[PDB]
Each structure stands twice: as C-alpha cells, then as structure tokens.
Design an enzyme around this catalytic site. Structure first.
Site, PDB file in Angstrom:
ATOM      1  N   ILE A  12       1.399  -4.364  -0.026  1.00 25.65           N
ATOM      2  CA  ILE A  12       2.139  -4.768   0.992  1.00 25.65           C
ATOM      3  C   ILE A  12       1.712  -4.140   2.376  1.00 25.65           C
ATOM      4  O   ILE A  12       1.520  -4.637   3.024  1.00 25.65           O
ATOM      5  CB  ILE A  12       3.592  -6.118   0.761  1.00 25.65           C
ATOM      6  CG1 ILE A  12       2.887  -7.574   0.329  1.00 25.65           C
ATOM      7  CG2 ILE A  12       4.239  -6.659   1.597  1.00 25.65           C
ATOM      8  CD1 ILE A  12       1.967  -7.997   0.970  1.00 25.65           C
ATOM      9  N   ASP A  34       5.281   7.354  -0.651  1.00 25.61           N
ATOM     10  CA  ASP A  34       4.963   6.766  -1.896  1.00 25.61           C
ATOM     11  C   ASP A  34       5.005   8.041  -3.043  1.00 25.61           C
ATOM     12  O   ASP A  34       4.593   9.165  -3.124  1.00 25.61           O
ATOM     13  CB  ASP A  34       3.560   6.411  -2.115  1.00 25.61           C
ATOM     14  CG  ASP A  34       2.785   4.844  -3.074  1.00 25.61           C
ATOM     15  OD1 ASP A  34       2.824   5.736  -3.778  1.00 25.61           O
ATOM     16  OD2 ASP A  34       2.952   3.912  -2.399  1.00 25.61           O
ATOM     17  N   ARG A  78      11.335   9.560  -4.744  1.00 24.32           N
ATOM     18  CA  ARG A  78      11.718   8.470  -5.742  1.00 24.32           C
ATOM     19  C   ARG A  78      13.345   8.152  -4.622  1.00 24.32           C
ATOM     20  O   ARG A  78      13.124   7.156  -4.950  1.00 24.32           O
ATOM     21  CB  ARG A  78      12.035   8.693  -6.543  1.00 24.32           C
ATOM     22  CG  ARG A  78      12.569   6.984  -7.431  1.00 24.32           C
ATOM     23  CD  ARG A  78      11.728   7.078  -9.510  1.00 24.32           C
ATOM     24  NE  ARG A  78      10.873   6.239  -9.250  1.00 24.32           N
ATOM     25  CZ  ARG A  78      11.445   4.466  -8.643  1.00 24.32           C
ATOM     26  NH1 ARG A  78      12.680   4.245  -8.787  1.00 24.32           N
ATOM     27  NH2 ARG A  78      10.621   3.086  -8.743  1.00 24.32           N
ATOM     28  N   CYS A 152       7.093 -15.243   0.906  1.00 28.42           N
ATOM     29  CA  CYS A 152       5.660 -15.329   1.225  1.00 28.42           C
ATOM     30  C   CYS A 152       5.960 -16.529   1.512  1.00 28.42           C
ATOM     31  O   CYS A 152       5.443 -17.628   2.535  1.00 28.42           O
ATOM     32  CB  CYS A 152       4.579 -14.746   1.331  1.00 28.42           C
ATOM     33  SG  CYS A 152       4.511 -15.254  -0.926  1.00 28.42           S
ATOM     34  N   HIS A 179       0.017 -21.078  -6.507  1.00 28.06           N
ATOM     35  CA  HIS A 179       0.198 -20.266  -5.587  1.00 28.06           C
ATOM     36  C   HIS A 179      -0.546 -19.239  -6.287  1.00 28.06           C
ATOM     37  O   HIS A 179      -0.906 -19.074  -7.244  1.00 28.06           O
ATOM     38  CB  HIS A 179       1.260 -19.387  -6.110  1.00 28.06           C
ATOM     39  CG  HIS A 179       2.029 -18.141  -5.156  1.00 28.06           C
ATOM     40  ND1 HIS A 179       1.427 -16.952  -5.147  1.00 28.06           N
ATOM     41  CD2 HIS A 179       3.235 -18.100  -4.081  1.00 28.06           C
ATOM     42  CE1 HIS A 179       1.814 -15.580  -3.751  1.00 28.06           C
ATOM     43  NE2 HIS A 179       2.611 -16.656  -3.648  1.00 28.06           N
ATOM     44  N   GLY A 211      12.760 -18.744  -6.048  1.00 30.90           N
ATOM     45  CA  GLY A 211      14.339 -18.963  -5.153  1.00 30.90           C
ATOM     46  C   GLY A 211      13.913 -19.306  -3.733  1.00 30.90           C
ATOM     47  O   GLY A 211      14.319 -19.826  -2.986  1.00 30.90           O
ATOM     48  N   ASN A 314      -0.809 -15.760   1.482  1.00 30.36           N
ATOM     49  CA  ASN A 314       0.889 -15.312   0.886  1.00 30.36           C
ATOM     50  C   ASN A 314       0.497 -13.328   1.449  1.00 30.36           C
ATOM     51  O   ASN A 314       1.446 -12.923   0.695  1.00 30.36           O
ATOM     52  CB  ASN A 314       0.885 -15.698  -0.905  1.00 30.36           C
ATOM     53  CG  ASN A 314      -0.343 -14.928  -1.351  1.00 30.36           C
ATOM     54  OD1 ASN A 314      -0.310 -14.420  -2.285  1.00 30.36           O
ATOM     55  ND2 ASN A 314      -1.048 -15.861  -2.254  1.00 30.36           N
TER      56      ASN A 314
HETATM   57  N1  LIG Z   1       1.722 -12.093  -2.026  1.00 34.68           N
HETATM   58  C1  LIG Z   1       2.490 -10.541  -2.418  1.00 34.68           C
HETATM   59  O1  LIG Z   1       1.506  -9.698  -2.726  1.00 34.68           O
HETATM   60  C2  LIG Z   1       3.829 -10.637  -1.427  1.00 34.68           C
HETATM   61  C3  LIG Z   1       4.091 -11.524  -1.050  1.00 34.68           C
HETATM   62  C4  LIG Z   1       5.434 -11.898   0.037  1.00 34.68           C
HETATM   63  C5  LIG Z   1       6.222 -10.287  -0.330  1.00 34.68           C
HETATM   64  N2  LIG Z   1       6.246  -9.439  -1.236  1.00 34.68           N
HETATM   65  C6  LIG Z   1       6.973  -8.052  -1.573  1.00 34.68           C
HETATM   66  O2  LIG Z   1       6.579  -7.305  -0.861  1.00 34.68           O
HETATM   67  C7  LIG Z   1       7.044  -6.075  -1.917  1.00 34.68           C
HETATM   68  C8  LIG Z   1       5.900  -5.079  -2.324  1.00 34.68           C
HETATM   69  O3  LIG Z   1       4.884  -5.819  -3.025  1.00 34.68           O
HETATM   70  P1  LIG Z   1       3.130  -5.227  -3.578  1.00 34.68           P
HETATM   71  O4  LIG Z   1       2.554  -6.512  -3.990  1.00 34.68           O
HETATM   72  O5  LIG Z   1       2.812  -5.118  -2.923  1.00 34.68           O
HETATM   73  O6  LIG Z   1       3.427  -4.493  -4.783  1.00 34.68           O
HETATM   74  P2  LIG Z   1       2.555  -2.755  -4.924  1.00 34.68           P
HETATM   75  O7  LIG Z   1       3.675  -2.811  -7.258  1.00 34.68           O
HETATM   76  O8  LIG Z   1       1.188  -3.637  -5.282  1.00 34.68           O
HETATM   77  O9  LIG Z   1       3.366  -1.695  -4.412  1.00 34.68           O
HETATM   78  C9  LIG Z   1       4.441  -0.727  -4.060  1.00 34.68           C
HETATM   79  C10 LIG Z   1       3.964  -0.154  -4.091  1.00 34.68           C
HETATM   80  O10 LIG Z   1       5.182   0.796  -4.123  1.00 34.68           O
HETATM   81  C11 LIG Z   1       5.346   2.133  -4.625  1.00 34.68           C
HETATM   82  N3  LIG Z   1       6.354   2.809  -5.192  1.00 34.68           N
HETATM   83  C12 LIG Z   1       7.680   2.447  -5.973  1.00 34.68           C
HETATM   84  N4  LIG Z   1       8.104   2.920  -6.226  1.00 34.68           N
HETATM   85  C13 LIG Z   1       8.627   3.470  -5.621  1.00 34.68           C
HETATM   86  C14 LIG Z   1       9.987   4.606  -4.824  1.00 34.68           C
HETATM   87  N5  LIG Z   1      10.689   4.556  -5.366  1.00 34.68           N
HETATM   88  N6  LIG Z   1       9.519   5.652  -3.493  1.00 34.68           N
HETATM   89  C15 LIG Z   1       8.144   5.460  -3.535  1.00 34.68           C
HETATM   90  N7  LIG Z   1       6.917   4.334  -3.491  1.00 34.68           N
HETATM   91  C16 LIG Z   1       7.960   3.345  -4.383  1.00 34.68           C
HETATM   92  C17 LIG Z   1       4.243   2.146  -5.380  1.00 34.68           C
HETATM   93  O11 LIG Z   1       3.475   3.425  -5.564  1.00 34.68           O
HETATM   94  C18 LIG Z   1       3.605   0.986  -5.176  1.00 34.68           C
HETATM   95  O12 LIG Z   1       2.132   2.253  -4.520  1.00 34.68           O
HETATM   96  C19 LIG Z   1       7.536  -6.532  -3.281  1.00 34.68           C
HETATM   97  O13 LIG Z   1       9.306  -7.001  -2.707  1.00 34.68           O
HETATM   98  C20 LIG Z   1       6.789  -8.566  -2.983  1.00 34.68           C
HETATM   99  O14 LIG Z   1       7.363  -9.342  -3.773  1.00 34.68           O
HETATM  100  C21 LIG Z   1       4.778  -9.469  -1.944  1.00 34.68           C
HETATM  101 CS   LIG Z   2       1.893  11.341  -1.956  1.00 38.93          CS
END
Ligand SMILES: NC(=O)c1ccc[n+]([C@@H]2O[C@H](COP(=O)([O-])OP(=O)(O)OC[C@H]3O[C@@H](n4cnc5c(N)ncnc54)[C@H](O)[C@@H]3O)[C@@H](O)[C@H]2O)c1
Ligand SMILES: [Cs+]
Ligand SMILES: NC(=O)c1ccc[n+]([C@@H]2O[C@H](COP(=O)([O-])OP(=O)(O)OC[C@H]3O[C@@H](n4cnc5c(N)ncnc54)[C@H](O)[C@@H]3O)[C@@H](O)[C@H]2O)c1
Ligand SMILES: NC(=O)c1ccc[n+]([C@@H]2O[C@H](COP(=O)([O-])OP(=O)(O)OC[C@H]3O[C@@H](n4cnc5c(N)ncnc54)[C@H](O)[C@@H]3O)[C@@H](O)[C@H]2O)c1
Ligand SMILES: NC(=O)c1ccc[n+]([C@@H]2O[C@H](COP(=O)([O-])OP(=O)(O)OC[C@H]3O[C@@H](n4cnc5c(N)ncnc54)[C@H](O)[C@@H]3O)[C@@H](O)[C@H]2O)c1
Ligand SMILES: [Cs+]
Ligand SMILES: [Cs+]
Ligand SMILES: [Cs+]
Lengths: 334, 336, 336, 334
Positions: A12, A34, A78, A152, A179, A211, A314
C-alpha cells in the site's frame, strides 16, 4: 508543496509512492521507514507483479533510495518513537505498516515530529475516519490529526450507498465482496487463525469475514446497524466487486436505480464514484483510480429488494482515495 | 441392467459415464454418440484434468471404445435422426451436447429407438423439469418422456429454497452465484456472443447472466416471480457457491435459519442437500456428490432479510443429481 | 505516412495496432479486415485483459471503427481475393489471421492492391523470413514482397544464438521454451489435433512442439541442423523464457558468456536484445519491447556445455520486432 | 507392524500420514509432534487443497487426534529433546519440520528414544542419503540411523540418470526443473532473502537455484561434478518436470534413449521409475506414486547432445519414495 513520510513500504506504501509520482503536483514523499534493507525495498519498488516496472531509475545506498534522481531518506525503526519526521520537515505521515491501526500507537509519529497521520486501514481510537467523496467535508483541520482512510471495500460501498440511500433510502442490506486474494492469505494450506484463510489462496474460493459494511456507519451514521456482509476471496491478484442486496420502502426499477447513480456520478464526486454501462471484467478496472465503479449492467430488482454491484481495484482505487484525502489534509491548516 | 446411451461425450457426458461406473449397480452405458474421433474421445476419457485418471484400461477402434473390457459402441451422427438406439437396446439417452435442449429436437432420440431422454441442461418444450430431491415424485412414467435435469445452479438453489420457503416463506430473493469458469468461456480475449464471456477466463472475474433463479419456479412453482440473479465467473476450474439474499415475513435468526436446514438435511434428501459447519473452501466440495452443500457459517440475518450460501461442484454434483434422476426413470415403466 | 492494412484483428492484430499508435511516427493503420462484427472488434480493441484499456475513444458503425477521431475502414472477407487494399492506398498488409502463412495464399493481398505482405508467423514459400536485428539487412526491397517475421520464440532465440555463435561457435544445442498459454489451447479438456493442447491450459504444464529451434536456421543458416527443442506451456497469460543448452569448442565461463552478450547488447541491436542482471520474473518482461532479454543470472557452464536463458513477451516483444521490420520495409521502395 | 512418529505435521508430514494409510500394511503412525493446536492440525488433515478430503472421520482433543477411530498422540515440543518416542514404542521418526535437516540436531530424536530418523529433505551430517530404487541396497541397518531421503527433484532425476549413465554414460549435464510453486514462495510481492522468490508465485515464472542436480552425486558418486541445474517455479499447485540436457560419448538416437528407459522401468525399480508414451500434462501425474515418470514423447537428440524429460508429483511422488525407504528401514534390524 507538502512533504510526506510513509511508515511501511509494503504494497500500500509503494502504491502510495507511485500514486504521488503519477497523480499529485503538490505532495512529495521525502522519507520512508521500514524494517527491511534498501536493496530489497528498492527492488520491490522497481519491479511490481501488478503495476509493472516503475518508469524511473531507482538507486539505493544504506541511508536512502533515489528515484529519478530524487533522494528519499529511508529509516528502519520498529518504534516510530525513534523517528524524527521533523528533520525532513515532514508534515503528513501515511501509516501503512498494519501495526499501528490503534491511533494511540500511531500518534507516536506526531510525538516524533509529524503534524498529521493518515492510517491506511480501519483504525481504533482515531480522531475521524473518512471515505473521500462521502464525508470529507466534515474534516476538521484543527482537531482531526490522526485519521483513517477506512478500508478498500468501505471506499467501494460507501459512495454507492450514499447515493442510493439519499435517493431511495436503505432499510437493511447485506453485502458479498468477491475480492482478490491478499497477503494475509496462504499460498499453500498452512496454519492461520482463520481456518479458511489457511487454504491455498490461488486455487480456492475462500469465505472470510469483513467489517467493511458495518464500518460504512462511521462515514454515513444514518446507516448504522443497517448493513453487514462477508467476503469471498477468489484467484485474481487484484480487482474486486462489492455486491450489495438491500431493501427499500421506495418502489424502484432497474432503470431508476441506474439513473440515480449516473446522475450523481459527475464533477468531483465522479472521481470517487463512476457510472459504467460497459461490458466490464475485473482486468478492466485494474489500475482504475475511482473508489467505486458502478456496473449498471448488473443491477437487479425484485419487489422492494435491490441488488447492485460496484467494482474496485482494492490496491490502486483505494490508494487514489487515500491520496485525495491526503491532498485535502495538505490543502488546509497544518 | 437398464441400458443407457449418451449423446455428447464432453465434460458432462464423461462425468456421467464415470458416475455410472462409480455409483450405479443397475445402469450400464453401452453406446455413445459424439462428433469427434475415438482417439480423442478415449484420451479425454482416460485422462481428466479435474477428475484425474480413469481407474480402467481404455482401448479404441473405428467404431467402439472399450473400457475395462466392456465395449462401448460409438457413433458420430451430428443429427440424432441418423442414430439407431434400438440396435443396442438403449432405453435412456442422456442428451448432453448442448445443441438439443429444445425437446422438439431432442425427441429425435425417441424416434431413433430410445424410450426416454434426459436433457443435461435447462430445456424448452420439455415434458417436465426436475431437481432430484425437490420435485422428482411428480415424475410421471407415462407422460414424462423428454425431461430436463435443470442447471447446476438450480440443483444448488432449489433444495435450499424449498426448505426455507417451506419453513419461513420467501417473499423476494436475489442470488449471486460465484461460479467456476466453463468451457464456453474464452482462454484469451476472443469473440463471443456474450462480450463479457469473451474475456480471458482464468485471469478475470466475469459477470454473466443465469436463468437458474427464475428456473427454480419450474420445480417450485410457489416461487414464480420471486427470485432473480446473475453469476460471477471466477478463476477456479470447478466448484461454485450460490449466495441468496431474501426476505421473509417470519422472525428469524441465524440459529433458526441454520436449524431448519439441518433438520431437513437427512435421509434420502440429505444426499441432495448437506448441512455443514466445517470451514469450507471451494476445493473441499470438488467431487462432492450432493447437489447443494449449505454452509451454516455464512448465514447472516438483518431485520427480515436473510443471506444464505450453498456450495456445489457444478460438474460432479450436478452429474450425481442427474444420475439420481436417471435411476428414478430406470426404476419405472420404460414402454415404447 | 505509409498506410498499413491488417488482416486478422486478433491478439497480434490488436497488439500491432496499439504498437503503431504508441511507437511509430510514420505508419498509420487505415483499414482492417476480420471475420467478426464491429461491436466485438471495437470492444476487444478498447478493453484488453493483458494490455489494459486503450487510451482513446472508440466508436463503430457498419463498416468502420473510429479510434481517437481517426476512421478505420473495416472489411469482412474470409477470402482476401475479395479485398480492395488499393481503395484505401494500403502499401503494407500485416497478415495475422494464422490461415494464410502459405505465401502462395498470402500473395492474394498483392493482387488485391497491396505492395507488401508481412506474415506475423513462420510461413511457407515466402520470399524471405526475418528476425529484426539478426538478418534484416539482407532485406531486398525489389524481390522481398511476401515476407515472414518468424515466431515469437525465434525472435528470442536468434539474437542470443547469433552473438554466442559469432563469439564462441555453437556445435549443438537443445532448447526448452517455458511459454505462456496461447489462444489455440483449450480452457477445459476438449478436442484438439494436439492431444496435449486439448488439456485445460490454466491448470496444466502442457508440453508441445515448436519449430523455432530449427527455424532459426532460416535467419542464421550457419546453424542449420544444430538446434532442436520443444515448449512447455504454463499457466501465465503472457511472458515466456527460452532455455538453451549447447556445446562449444571454446573454453568458456559464466563470466565470458555473460560479457559477450553485454558487449553486443547496445545501439540499435540493444533494442532487440537486452542484457540484464536484475532479479527478473515473468511479470517484469510483460510489455517489454525487446525481442530477447538475456538473464545473466541464469547462465551456467559445465565443461564445454552452456545453459543460457532469455525472456520474451511473446505478445508485445514479438509485435515490437514485427513493427521494427515493418518500419524497415516502409523506409524503402514500395513499387507496384 | 513398526510404529512411526512424525515430527512436523505440515504438507510433507500429512502427505506421509495419508501415504501410510493408503499404501502400507506394516507401518502405523502412532504419534506426531507439532507446534500448532489440534483443531488446526486436524482441519488441515481432514481437508486438503491438493489431495481432497481424507476418506475417514477425524476427531481431536487436546492430547490427540483420532482418525478412523485410531488415536494418535500429539505433542508440541519445539525441542525434540523433550519428546519421549520410547513411550509409544516408536522405532522410526520422520523428520519433516525443516528445522532439523542438520543430523546433529535431528539425532535428538534418537536421544529422545527413537531408533531411526528419516529426514524428508537434503540433509547435512547424515549417516547416508538415499533415493529409493537407486542406492537403497547400500543401506546399512547397523550404521545408518539418521538418514535423508533427498529432495523431490533428486528423486526424479537420479533414477533416470542412473539408467542413462549406466547404458550410455553422461559426461556433463544441465537441468531445468519446471516446478510447482511451494510454500517458501510469496503469494504477493514481499521481502524474501531470494529476491525472485519474493514475487507473487501464482502469476509468475520464478527462477530459483536448486542443489538437486549436484546432490545426485550423493547417491550416484560416478556423476560427481558432472550435473548442475536450476528451477523455474510456475503457477501450478503441484506437479513438476525435470528437463535434463546432457552430452554422451555414445552415438544415440531418440529411439535408443527411449528403449533403455522402457527396458529398465520394470519390476520393483518400475515402481520408482515409469516409462510413458501417453500425451501427459501435469494434472495427469498428480497423485502418481512413482518418483520419476519418463516422457518418451519429449526425448530429443542433436549429435551427442540429449534432452530428456521426467515428471514428478513433488509432493506425493516424493512421499511414496520416502515411504518405500521407510518400509526398507522397518524390514531390517532396528
Ligand atoms: N488489498 C490491499 O492490499 C489493501 C486494501 C485496503 C487496505 N489495505 C491495508 O493497508 C495496510 C498495509 O497492507 P499491505 O498489503 O501494504 O501490507 P504489506 O505486508 O505488503 O506491507 C507492510 C510493510 O510494512 C513494513 N513494516 C512492518 N512492520 C514495520 C514496522 N514496525 N516499522 C516499519 N515498517 C514496518 C514491512 O517491511 C512491509 O514492507 C494494511 O492495514 C491493510 O489492511 C490493504
Ligand atoms: Cs531501511
Ligand atoms: N458446469 C458444467 O460444465 C455444466 C453444468 C450443468 C449443465 N451443463 C450442460 O451440459 C451440456 C453439455 O456441456 P459440457 O460442459 O459437457 O460441454 P462440452 O462441450 O464439454 O461437451 C460437448 C460434447 O458434445 C459433442 N457434440 C457437439 N455437437 C454434437 C452433435 N451435434 N452431435 C454429437 N455430439 C456433439 C462435442 O464433441 C463434445 O464432446 C450443456 O447443455 C451444458 O450446459 C454443464
Ligand atoms: N504469442 C502469440 O500470441 C503469438 C506470437 C507470435 C505469432 N503469433 C501468430 O499471429 C497470428 C495471429 O494469431 P493471434 O494470436 O492474434 O490469434 P487470434 O485468433 O487471437 O486472432 C485471429 C483473428 O483473425 C480473424 N480471422 C480468422 N480467420 C479469418 C479470415 N479468414 N479472414 C479474416 N479474419 C480472420 C479472427 O476473427 C481473429 O480476430 C498467428 O499466425 C499466430 O501464430 C502469435
Ligand atoms: N514440494 C514439496 O512440498 C516438498 C518436496 C520435497 C521435499 N520437501 C521438504 O519437506 C520438508 C517439509 O516441508 P513442507 O512443505 O511440509 O512444510 P510445511 O511448512 O508445510 O510444514 C512444516 C510443519 O512443521 C511444523 N513445525 C515447525 N517447526 C516445528 C518444531 N520445531 N517442532 C514441531 N513442529 C514444527 C509446523 O507447524 C508445520 O506444521 C522440507 O524440508 C521441504 O524441503 C517438500
Ligand atoms: Cs412412456
Ligand atoms: Cs517490389
Ligand atoms: Cs499439538
């Protein structure tokens, strides 16, 4: 230009980066945070299974990633408490890790020097939740500092629901989102707290809870208690549809449902919600920038029961909704 | 033994063949008619991307296929008027070509020596349409001669709808079926009368129409005018679910909806309709013999509006329903 | 502007149309001929499961399609003898139907008013076969009138094979191409002349034959007799890789194999053949314009036996090669 | 009957369980060890995305899982040292977690009361490595107590390679395995130590390394130094092919290559290696019990260079090879 930080350079996060590159003239992503090394992050930025190659040169060293010659500082705390967003004059942080959906956690970024946090997910304890196009006018520059852009699916359902509820009124409704599979699911059958999401995502129709329909009530309080739903995850990598079946007291036809959407889907709101009569399939809404693409070909009516279907990418649709929200925050008092 | 002929040895034709091998003690397939050559026919019988390998030796020559020692005579008339079903004593023809769902055409098998035709699909001008377990007791062995086994989706929807309508009454209902892609869809973007089914099936969610929601009214006439729906074709090769949302005048909960299905899902009817509380995904209902597998875990209630969901193997579930129907037919008259 | 006609507005036909829109300053498509109706044609042009939405308005009527204001006349003769290419001043016809790869048939376009035919496929009895960047300088604008652009696989293999044969000499080589499924494969198990391509394409690894390894000898005659191979069709909609294992008399390492490709992969030739050290997977070469993308990371050496691997977008890469060829043709004579 | 324990009730573990149920008359799995709760394990045993439903009733409590009325004790030590295999009179443990491929670790099971350990993977420090049908006659009941059954790909390549090298001699060879995606890969683009395996497995051809061709040398020392290879992971959930291109000094034809395989593929060795002239695709070798299904339709010859292709179900084929090995161990001195 307002300077932006991303916490969590995942799907995202990298979507959001690209969206800024492609779509914004007044936001600049100047820093990201990250856990992972820069070689890995810069590789995933450069090459994407869904979005294709980034159209620009990507370089990295241990402190940064440089995209088209613009240097991005990359950190690896982190704990957001250890960041210093103020060093880069970052006004807005996009919270996209998934481990700070609690705003009491997420506001660490404000402490750590940011002025605003936008959580890219359903949140708890937030100042406000928005779906752009639905209730963004209720944004309060002074008091809304840690916000959510919702989910989404909510960004798909809420706009359609507003138009139909405004024009006809919804008594009760039940949603199925068909989805794309997402990263929380398994590739091969393996332990998971949700024993259906445990099953091989790319060969299965997988039912799972969401939800997203009750969360509509957050942006449209008139619908509190009225909507619920679930999801069927299916084997496409992105692209989804929200199928809403609802009862109205109005007497309505396929034609009047459709005309209400077409009527509403114009001007600025038309960038969130589109009206389509085309022969759409999911690959046609991949990389579509709307939050909701209403499929007038699918509308059904039986008595006082109505079925409507809206599409959404999404990933990208959601991201463009979040970027719209971010532009609002940036355009107002910080 | 009652002797069975199959016209159209495709997905359903070969499903039916195998179901008879596996599941029947009194039917035997002795002749098949198909447009294509016996090398192809017997390769596709032996090896199946969905059902896997037939557990039997298969050999062919110019006018038969032999399966586990048993010779099946094979014809290749594109027009059924040219078939001689009587030459092999075929009592029942399975019409599974997709091109003879008009009973006015399908009756060409009766003239050709058959006593009964079962159309593996929604038909027109037929004597009778059945969903086994729902209305098969209205089967009239004198006057029901060219009959339909309806559609896969109808064999899922009707057992469920009957029970809940019987118990709570259904006012109105709209259905979405999330359905495996089928053989009429295109692998790559390519011309099709249905410009959505023209689109690459294995990388798209493809909306399409279905008559199933209306066609329920043939077998449950109490529901005429009350149901509509559409399908979403999705990238799995088999397995589907029917999602029905409807209104009742009863006051209902999830618990009461689910209990009604469970009390009904027993004895012979239970082999048509199952009740499940398991954490099911599509691969778990592949090769399930039920017409309908009600997922108690997916039932939702809002006000007087209910959502229920039932799974089906649109290939094997349908075929097992069709075989139930065939067994009924084969258990009665068979004159003329 | 040189005026271009396309015969067969399918995957490659519509790829070519788009490549011209995107990539050419001097060609214009002004007429297309296809068997199917213009509603279908224009829907498939506008919306594409692989390339996504055309970035232009598309409208149709009974004998044209209009794309971004520009009217394209559309015909529908199953026999090219009935076409009037001269009526629109078409200089070059792209023959992409798959049914006129015999140049003796394809020449029907020349009689119909065209000056040149490019067959989007291996041909028979053609004047000349080219892989752009490999042998296009042997293009004879007087005597090369009906020509082939060879196959996607050949446009991958040849640029690579040329370089390494030039540098180290290839004694013998065997190839496997791991290839996206194509439109001639079946979605569900169903009759096909090739009993392996009969099998559901999106759930199988499907072995099939290809002429590409032999057909290289048309454009690199030094390699005649030295290469063979086959294809494995796998469940991705586009993107493919060619895996070649071969013998040389040279003493070689991974480093020396890779350095030879890299030194060659520049200037104009570099737009046909790329050299990559990136961690590539198939989706990363989708919509890549090169004919061949050499993956330095996959090179292996054992004794005097070398394995090299090159990626290609069997749709867009091939199309961009074909457009290179068309641009060459359009840059020379065009008499008669 | 010899009583068997499984450590690691994952894909390969649950495969092995089923294989015993389906195929063995003299082994009984009496205990298993896994980190996860019994509800989760029993659900994955009952329902399988690749193998279908187990044909038997499955029950669980907190100490056990009962299959067709036979009670299996289930433990949950992350440290084999804490097991007591001797309590259940377990003679053979199948080590299938993936976290004890080092035999110095795996022999904890011997300490913990077992008499033999079979590691379901390439191992380090083992007493011996076997591919059944290739070098199992060199099994030493006294000194071979912690062994490996090698890899799936090695179980495909080794039998074919033995026959061809015995009959014609292989000077040098290079392999491509076109392989089903496996659980080490990602569903969506995400960090991974292998930046190609980081990419969405079910929409990508993914190249990756494998030791499987050099490991042939472990069971066929005459081929040491002579073979190498890599893998192309593709979007099928199981089912793989090994494509070997090799040089021989012999003068050989498609026909003589094929006849050698057909000649060898008989009797007991014919249960490991099959010879086929059928029009095979990957779904036809799913649930095939051979380690290697030679596809004579694919054999190519150019001069002294030969290309052969063998299929394998990387899950079930491998498992049946491992069960064959287990039967040997059980049939001899413990
Ligand atoms: N369909 C979709 O992909 C979608 C749609 C709507 C909402 N979202 C939401 O977007 C959010 C992110 O989802 P995503 O699919 O991108 O996930 P992802 O797992 O692809 O990305 C997570 C990233 O966060 C990093 N990370 C984890 N913990 C960390 C920390 N403590 N400090 C710094 N970096 C950290 C990881 O290295 C990774 O790069 C979620 O809450 C998800 O529900 C996703
Ligand atoms: Cs980094
Ligand atoms: N999910 C499903 O696949 C499904 C479910 C329910 C009902 N059905 C119905 O079953 C019927 C058959 O469908 P299918 O999926 O097996 O299709 P199919 O195309 O796989 O099989 C059709 C077969 O008929 C043969 N054929 C065609 N025209 C013929 C003719 N004139 N004479 C003789 N043989 C001829 C073909 O060679 C082929 O072997 C259709 O009516 C279809 O709607 C299919
Ligand atoms: N990977 C690839 O797809 C690929 C790669 C290289 C070469 N090619 C070659 O390109 C050619 C076209 O293949 P494609 O994949 O675009 O196929 P396609 O089937 O997608 O397109 C064929 C088109 O031709 C039309 N057509 C058929 N017969 C006709 C006739 N007699 N007159 C006019 N129009 C007719 C059809 O309506 C359709 O629109 C073939 O020779 C194929 O081998 C394809
Ligand atoms: N294609 C294949 O699937 C394939 C082929 C050949 C070999 N193998 C090998 O088989 C082995 C197992 O692979 P898999 O695919 O079954 O993996 P998996 O991840 O599906 O199974 C691992 C299981 O081990 C359990 N576990 C992990 N650590 C544990 C511990 N410390 N104590 C107890 N239980 C523990 C987990 O709960 C899980 O149930 C690997 O070495 C793999 O390389 C797999
Ligand atoms: Cs009768
Ligand atoms: Cs000329
Ligand atoms: Cs346990």
């Amino acid at each position: 230009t307002i300077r932006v930080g991303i916490n969590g350079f995942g799907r995202i996060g990298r979507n959001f980066f690209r969206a800024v590159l492609e779509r914004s003239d007044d936001l600049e992503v100047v820093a990201v945070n990250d856990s992972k090394d820069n070689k890995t992050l810069s590789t995933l930025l450069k090459f994407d299974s869904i979005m294709g190659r980034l159209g620009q040169e990507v370089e990295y060293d241990d402190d940064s990633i440089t995209v088209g010659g613009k240097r991005i500082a990359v950190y690896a705390e982190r704990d957001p408490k250890n960041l210093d967003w103020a060093a880069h004059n970052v006004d807005i942080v996009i919270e996209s890790t998934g481990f700070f959906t609690d705003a009491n956690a997420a506001k660490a970024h404000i402490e750590a020097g940011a002025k605003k946090v936008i959580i890219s997910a359903p949140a708890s304890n937030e100042d406000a939740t928005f779906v752009y196009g639905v209730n963004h006018e209720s944004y309060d520059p002074e008091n809304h500092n840690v916000i959510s852009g919702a989910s989404c699916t909510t960004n798909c359902l809420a706009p359609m629901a507003k138009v139909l509820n405004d024009k006809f009124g919804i008594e009760n409704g039940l949603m199925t989102t068909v989805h794309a599979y997402t990263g929380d699911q398994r590739l091969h059958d393996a332990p998971h707290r949700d024993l259906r999401r445990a099953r091989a995502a790319a060969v299965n129709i997988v039912p799972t809870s969401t939800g997203a329909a009750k969360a509509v009530a957050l942006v449209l309080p008139e619908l509190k208690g009225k909507l619920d739903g679930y999801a069927l995850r299916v084997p496409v990598i992105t692209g989804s549809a929200t199928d809403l079946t609802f009862n109205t007291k109005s007497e309505v036809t396929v034609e009047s449902i459709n005309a209400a959407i077409k009527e509403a889907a114009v001007g600025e709101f038309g960038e969130t919600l589109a009206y389509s009569e085309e022969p759409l399939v999911s690959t046609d809404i991949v990389h579509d920038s709307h939050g909701s693409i209403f499929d007038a070909g699918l509308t059904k009516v039986s008595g006082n029961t109505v079925k409507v279907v809206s599409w959404y990418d999404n990933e990208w649709g959601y991201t463009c909704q979040l970027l719209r929200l971010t532009e609002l925050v940036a355009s107002k008092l910080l």
